[PDB]
Symmetry: C2
Subunit: 279 residues, 2 copies
């Protein structure tokens, strides 16, 4: 394509533990180190959650602040994207980190099932989170778990609800949500190209679908995500030894399709972000 490809690394998430894979970074220091390697390997965006030291989920703003400072000092220029995840926190707590003014924050605009629960995003919460992102000038990345979420995001964006330039992530392979289905993927891409041609998109696959969805996205001209949050293995059994190892796989696919890996500067420009991180 020669079009640069933005690789996002989803470093930790809310679910995986060191019992699942010893490579999962849990503490801030672990996260900074893991993220730096990933940055070096080609990731331009860090998609961040925080944890308690024991690995349990957290939404604590002070932990986000600590992580951010580490990323700003060790990964200068890298785009810092905070989760507002529903497995990491509940209600308005899910937006308590927003006043820190990250570059970006992931945002669900719909609800859907998850492996063991409803992933709840009530309309009032969606609207509140979106308003906070307008206030603090935080560009959302929309985490679209189903088709109507893509359409909703497009409508919202046109209506001014979503700060900045529209960036939609197709999340595929989550149990009880949307599987990694190639025909659906192509329809998703069609919706973006036809209904939101000025917007950007990416795609993320879970588990064994991570690498496959990377390939789909990269070959189709979009952007993509990888990392331990989404997948802890290299095949049916083999554990992935780092976030960076997963990034390198994505990089190889960029090479295969003759697309440069977007630098953090390119990624900022593509996504309509400030040229330098705030704060």
């Amino acid at each position: 394509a020669n079009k640069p490809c933005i690789i996002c690394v989803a470093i930790t998430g809310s679910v995986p533990t060191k019992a699942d894979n010893p490579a999962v970074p849990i503490t801030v220091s672990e996260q900074v180190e893991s993220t730096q390697e990933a940055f070096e390997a080609g990731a331009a965006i860090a998609h961040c959650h925080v944890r308690n030291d024991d690995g349990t989920p957290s939404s604590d703003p002070d932990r986000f602040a600590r992580l951010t400072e580490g990323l700003h000092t060790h990964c200068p220029g890298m785009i810092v994207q905070f989760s507002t995840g529903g497995r990491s926190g509940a209600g308005q707590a899910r937006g308590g980190m927003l006043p820190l003014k990250p570059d970006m924050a992931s945002l669900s605009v719909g609800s859907n099932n998850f492996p063991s629960r409803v992933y709840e995003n009530p309309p009032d919460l969606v609207d509140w989170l979106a308003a906070q992102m307008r206030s603090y000038r935080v560009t959302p990345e929309i985490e679209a778990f189903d088709l109507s979420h893509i359409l909703r995001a497009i409508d919202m964006h046109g209506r001014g609800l979503l700060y900045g330039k529209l960036y939609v992530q197709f999340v595929m392979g989550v149990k009880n949500a949307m599987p990694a289905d190639r025909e659906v993927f192509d329809f998703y891409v069609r919706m973006m190209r036809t209904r939101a041609p000025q917007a950007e998109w990416c795609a993320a696959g879970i588990g064994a679908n991570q690498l496959t969805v990377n390939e789909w996205a990269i070959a189709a001209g979009g952007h993509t995500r990888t990392g331990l949050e989404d997948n802890i293995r290299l095949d049916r059994q083999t554990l992935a030894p780092s976030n960076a190892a997963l990034v390198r796989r994505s990089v190889e696919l960029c090479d295969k399709y003759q697309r440069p890996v977007a630098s953090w500067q390119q990624a900022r420009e593509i996504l309509g972000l400030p040229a330098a991180a705030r704060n």
Copy 2:
């Protein structure tokens, strides 16, 4: 097509009240009368909720039993479909009417947003409701509020989770869910035709989209739903005077597209139901 078209009437729902439109049937007697007229007008399936006398939502099995007896005596042969709706009840209460052995029951297999809330269908509840429908030999009608729900239903059906023959309803126009979008509709139809060619489908539109979605479904060879549950008006302002009036609109569209209105006998055969109601 000359293919018969099954018209379902959604008589009451959980939301509309007599304050919204005086034609909404609330009590069992009202419901039987309204349903009979609709039956006479061409509806083969009654999609039923029950209410307290004051119009508030209910899941009471005894009220379902009463309604069923009325429909069996006044609308003999008509297919009786019970709601397991999340606005009418919570948790396993949403399946408490199933032991009455209706012909069918509506079932959500995913979650999604609604006008003012998350429409919660946790995976454990979906699985429980499905198991109850297997036990009691109640054929589900899948209420698909988004694309992944259609795919999930197809997968479930192939795996034996869904009793009887697969029947999927595309529900379009619910605020914060999936809008009535023609391109999505055509994709939905493609999924059914290609992924589940032995299955049947229908489509239902909310509000001002009711008539439009009727036309889309009827012209495309599928089946459809109408009724006061889904829409209380005939245009921007004019109230619909009965469930039957809404059915007649659907019938006109069948005439337009040269499709006969399925008799209740045809509908039973198409949907793989017993030739006569149990009990």
